[PDB]
Design a protein around this nucleic acid. Structure first.
Ligand SMILES: Nc1nc2c(ncn2[C@@H]2O[C@H](COP(=O)(O)OP(=O)(O)CP(=O)(O)O)[C@@H](O)[C@H]2O)c(=O)[nH]1
Ligand SMILES: [K+]
Ligand SMILES: [Mg+2]
Ligand SMILES: [Mg+2]
Ligand SMILES: [Mg+2]
Ligand SMILES: [Mg+2]
Ligand SMILES: [Mg+2]
Ligand SMILES: [Mg+2]
Ligand SMILES: [Mg+2]
Ligand SMILES: [Mg+2]
Ligand SMILES: [Mg+2]
Ligand SMILES: [Mg+2]
Ligand SMILES: [Zn+2]
Lengths: 418, 36, 133, 177, 122
RNA sequence: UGGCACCUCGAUGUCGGCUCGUCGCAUCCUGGGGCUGUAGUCGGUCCCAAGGGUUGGGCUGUUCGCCCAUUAAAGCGGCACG
RNA sequence: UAUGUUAAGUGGAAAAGGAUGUGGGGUUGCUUAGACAACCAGGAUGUUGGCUUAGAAGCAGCCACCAUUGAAAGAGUGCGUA
């Protein structure tokens, strides 16, 4: 059924501390749990032993036993000794934000890449905590003496080695999977298709933008990407063709969303996943302009991109949800900023116009004379470049069109000087 | 070649034959070559 | 598929001797899967088979599940010895005897029905066959 | 066996004889000798050869058919003969011969040399055209296959050595963009 | 005979003065290096203000050893020290001057600039 | 990693290293091949194959591991954890 | 001894699945007014059906799928061109 939980937080000199508890409640509501009470404390430093102090523990226990809760959720990462102390004091179950995010990710992992990533993150998180957890059985006080027969080791060494071993096996499987993944990018790298990637915060509107663009400018436009409010809807990346009316081709990629106060054991998984965004040719930053806190989001967004390791890539900041705001006109371009609504034909037209302006800038005018009997080149021009005017001459076809340097070099014999 | 316990046709031009006591599939598409 | 409540939390495992008592004929739809052997069938297997065979038909026609997981089973963790009482319940199971019809479908032609039942039968731990009313 | 029941009409100038299971065929172009299993039997008269089938079971049917086919090919090869033709495709691909030795320049750092065995001959109408001739199906086929195996055709340009009756499966070097 | 942990005096113009050898190149189980062989090494003493700095990992060629070389006509050569010259990825020196005598074996291994810059090629 | 308690409590020496190896193949290198999202270069994957080969250091009692510098390559396991 | 089966050394070790192995039965279509397989010949005309496209001529795609001579001959089964 649904479990009853509590959420506990300290001010800790955070600048807001209120959106943090709001999003913690939202995350709990995304794990088939409901918040039946929150406790906050305005302490500028974190308690070393119980994270809240002596009196707050009793207050929390009283509220939990009055509201009939089954678990307590703490807004920040805990310590193994803190977990031991809180569990002993409360006589309940204790869980922290990192555990909550891992729980959210575990049951939404479909492809085994995500499943293995979450598995390794969970084992890495639980590895330091097993010390006092297993000492209760290990610290049996009475075990023996000198024996002249034995393992030549103490039990702590043995169980440390056992827990250390399996981590390497799981990481090895991860590495093999990523190496296999690099095989499927061979065709993209061998050719030189430009790539543009959508990034941003969660529920910003990336998937809707991608679906609109795909419906507008794709051959197999029936290939849509899932969209919803919920929570981390897309846990996988997608790549699609986009072909423009002026006969230009590029690839559009979609990736996952993130949230503030992100665990460090899972940022490695995100760094593995965002490897397509790392080698992108253009970045589109979707921002939910309607949300008042959106500004804060932008900062934390760059922070994530600073950690996975994507930099020096041109970025266009797109402000979604323009229709939800009153007394505003859209689409509009200001510097490297776009104001638009994803569910609009004209907004998508403006965004794709901006993309075409930014990426393709080395398509210059050129004139070619293709002889009639030696034809089969006008088709290449029309299906690989945008033409302006062609003429039916007695000696052949006189075409003028704007092309790329590769086309110029390939068609260097047909050029005519002026 | 694909070496599997479950050799079966993959298109409508695949053909199932036996050679040296082994079941196998031949086709015009070389990706469809299977041996059991 | 889990029962809402039970009178007892622990139960004997039972046996599977003999032919199925009832439910050996197609009674609602036109097509059915019949068990040829006996087996425990869990609710994960039922759910996987149902999703496969329903997705193939694109939510057309009707599907009837003729078995329910009434029985529960327990287990013991790694590292515990024998004794000290019975273990904790894990899942829910249906014991299926030979001859039992466990899935029925209607509302689709021969080809769709037979292919959906073939797709479903590969998710199950028992040896099956396809029968028509 | 429909094949096994068909009659063999002996052409003029070729003679066929039986020594037990062994069969010998002579004519304008050469002499052949071959051994068959005794379970099958052959009749002899002026201008017809008939191979008969004692039993109707599997291997016996197959042997009947293949015995008739082998006799037919043997007699035809002695009488008229057999040939195969080979083409070379590619820039610089050259076929030549010095006496009784075929020399191929097919893109390696060294030329490839071929010498025909007894009963088989190699002819070079043009620098990119080879012909294998002989009065034995198996040997002509084997030598043509050996020559072709030096540089079989490749799917990106068609270059290599191929039969005239070959359709090469063609692929495109660069696709996707 | 230069193997790992043996130290050499640097005989060229670059900032290094003494070098400790880390690896003898040219095979998996190779142990010693002779005149005309390349080694990987680290700078133990340096001259302040030079191009090569202390603690740098470089590679160098041995130009004279205390157990020298035998020639094919039956004669031998030996020196009173072990000395090396710091080189680039090609066989060119990283200095502008070379001090002391150099063995003739550098010419067979195609170290032409080192041979031309030396005061004497014995 | 466990379960059981069948031989040994009128004794079956217990970790790591050193010396000396030997065997399996689910093959790390080298040899032969089919498919490729195999143009070439560089690769991926599978089939055959156990003939030979398969590094020196810093830290830690460590096995393992991380790092430095190499190599064609720095395989995984059994033999009372030989 | 009699009548059959198996070609794996199955017999003398192991499952889900996969398969023109082989034997025995039971139904059903066509055929000496000529069946199945090969060989010879034809396989046509309005017409490049309309739309779309720079094109689209049976064979990128959408909507139609008629008529004539004639033994039949698709507004086309696949390859191929741009
Ligand atoms: N009013 C308005 N609503 C919009 C606009 N664009 C998107 N939305 C709403 O916001 C939601 C965006 O969801 P989605 O794009 O799937 O979020 P997401 O970025 O994929 C979250 P994740 O990172 O997990 O994939 C949609 O359900 C849509 O209804 C807009 O321009 N105007
Ligand atoms: K089954
Ligand atoms: Mg003690
Ligand atoms: Mg010396
Ligand atoms: Mg030293
Ligand atoms: Mg005793
Ligand atoms: Mg050390
Ligand atoms: Mg190397
Ligand atoms: Mg061992
Ligand atoms: Mg199975
Ligand atoms: Mg049978
Ligand atoms: Mg016919
Ligand atoms: Zn096929």
């Amino acid at each position: 059924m649904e479990k009853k939980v509590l959420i506990v937080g300290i001010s800790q000199k955070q600048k807001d501390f209120d959106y943090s508890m709001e999003e913690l409640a939202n995350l709990a509501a995304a794990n088939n749990m409901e918040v039946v009470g929150e406790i906050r404390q305005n302490i500028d430093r974190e308690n070393r032993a119980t994270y809240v102090g002596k009196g707050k523990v009793d207050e929390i226990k009283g509220l939990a036993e009055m509201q009939d809760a089954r678990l307590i959720i703490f807004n920040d990462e805990l310590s193994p000794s803190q977990i031991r102390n809180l569990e002993e004091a409360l006589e309940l179950d204790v869980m922290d934000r990192t555990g909550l995010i891992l729980a959210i990710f575990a049951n939404r992992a479909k492809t085994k890449e995500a499943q293995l990533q979450v598995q390794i993150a969970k084992l890495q998180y639980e590895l330091p905590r097993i010390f006092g957890q297993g000492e209760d059985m290990d610290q049996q006080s009475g075990k023996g003496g000198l024996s002249n027969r034995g393992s030549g080791e103490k039990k702590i060494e043995t169980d440390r080695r056992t827990i250390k071993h399996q981590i390497r096996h799981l990481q090895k499987e991860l590495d093999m999977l990523v190496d296999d993944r690099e095989v499927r990018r061979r065709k993209r790298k061998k050719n030189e298709i430009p790539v543009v990637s959508l990034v941003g915060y969660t529920n910003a509107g990336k998937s809707t933008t991608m679906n609109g663009l795909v419906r507008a400018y794709s051959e197999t436009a029936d290939k849509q990407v899932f969209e919803k409010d919920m929570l981390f809807a897309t846990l996988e990346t997608s790549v699609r063709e986009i072909v423009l009316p002026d006969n230009k081709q590029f690839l559009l990629t979609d990736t996952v969303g993130f949230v503030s106060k992100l665990p460090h054991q899972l940022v490695k998984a995100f760094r593995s996943t965002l490897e397509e965004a790392r080698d992108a040719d253009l970045l589109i930053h979707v921002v939910d302009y309607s949300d008042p806190h959106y500004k804060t989001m932008m900062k934390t967004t760059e922070e994530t991109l600073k950690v996975v390791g994507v930099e020096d890539v041109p970025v266009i900041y797109a402000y979604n949800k323009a229709d939800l705001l009153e007394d505003e006109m859209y689409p509009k371009q200001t510097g490297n900023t776009i104001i638009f609504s994803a569910r609009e034909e004209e907004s998508l037209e403006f965004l794709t116009e901006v993309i075409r302006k930014e990426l393709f800038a080395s398509y210059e005018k050129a004139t070619f004379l293709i002889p009639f009997e030696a034809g089969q080149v006008v088709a290449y021009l029309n299906e690989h470049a945008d033409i302006l005017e062609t003429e039916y001459l007695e000696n052949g076809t006189q075409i003028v069109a704007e092309v790329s340097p590769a086309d110029l070099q390939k068609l260097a014999e047909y050029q005519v000087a002026e | 070649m694909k070496v599997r316990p479950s050799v079966k046709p993959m298109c409508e031009k695949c053909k199932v034959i036996r050679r040296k006591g082994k079941v196998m599939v031949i086709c015009e598409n070389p990706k469809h070559k299977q041996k059991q | 598929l889990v029962p809402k409540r039970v009178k007892y939390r622990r139960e004997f495992r039972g046996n599977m001797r003999g032919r199925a008592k009832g439910g050996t004929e197609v009674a609602f739809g036109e097509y059915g899967l019949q068990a040829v052997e006996a087996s425990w069938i869990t609710n994960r297997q039922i759910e996987a088979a149902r999703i496969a065979m329903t997705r193939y038909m694109k939510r057309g026609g009707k599907v009837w599940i003729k078995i329910f997981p009434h029985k529960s089973y327990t287990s013991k963790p790694i590292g515990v010895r024998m004794g000290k009482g019975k273990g904790a319940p894990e899942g829910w199971v249906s014991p299926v005897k030979r001859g039992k019809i466990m899935f029925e479908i209607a509302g689709v032609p021969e080809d769709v029905a037979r292919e959906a039942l073939r797709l479903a039968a590969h998710k199950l731990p028992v040896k099956t066959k396809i029968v028509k009313r | 066996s429909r094949i096994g029941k068909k009659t063999i009409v002996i052409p003029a100038g070729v003679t066929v004889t039986l020594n037990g299971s062994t069969a010998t065929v002579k004519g304008p172009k050469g002499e052949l000798v071959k051994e068959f299993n005794p379970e099958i039997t052959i009749n002899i008269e002026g201008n017809e050869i008939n191979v008969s089938r004692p039993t109707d079971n599997k291997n016996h049917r197959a042997l009947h058919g293949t015995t008739r086919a082998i006799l037919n090919n043997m007699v035809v090869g002695v009488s008229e003969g057999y040939e195969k033709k080979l083409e070379l495709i590619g820039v610089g691909y050259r076929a030549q011969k010095q006496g009784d030795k075929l020399v191929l320049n097919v893109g390696y750092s060294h030329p490839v040399e071929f010498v025909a065995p007894k009963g088989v001959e190699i002819e070079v109408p043009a620098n990119t055209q080879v012909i294998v001739k002989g009065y034995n199906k198996e040997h002509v086929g084997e030598l043509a296959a050996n020559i072709r195996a030096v540089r079989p055709p490749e799917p990106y340009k068609g270059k290599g050595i191929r039969y005239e009756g070959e359709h090469v499966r063609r692929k495109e070097g660069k696709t996707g963009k | 005979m230069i193997q790992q942990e043996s130290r050499m005096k640097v005989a060229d113009n670059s900032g290094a003065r003494e070098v400790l050898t880390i690896k003898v190149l040219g095979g998996s189980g190779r142990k010693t290096a002779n005149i005309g062989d390349v080694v990987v090494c680290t700078v133990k003493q340096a001259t302040p203000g030079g191009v090569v700095k202390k603690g740098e990992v470089v590679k160098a060629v041995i130009v004279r050893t205390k157990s020298g070389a035998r020639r094919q006509d039956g004669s031998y050569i030996k020196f009173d020290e072990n000395a090396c010259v710091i080189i680039r990825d090609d066989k060119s020196p990283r200095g502008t001057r070379i001090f002391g005598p150099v063995a003739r074996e550098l010419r067979e291994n195609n170290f032409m600039k080192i041979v031309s810059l030396a005061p004497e090629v014995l």
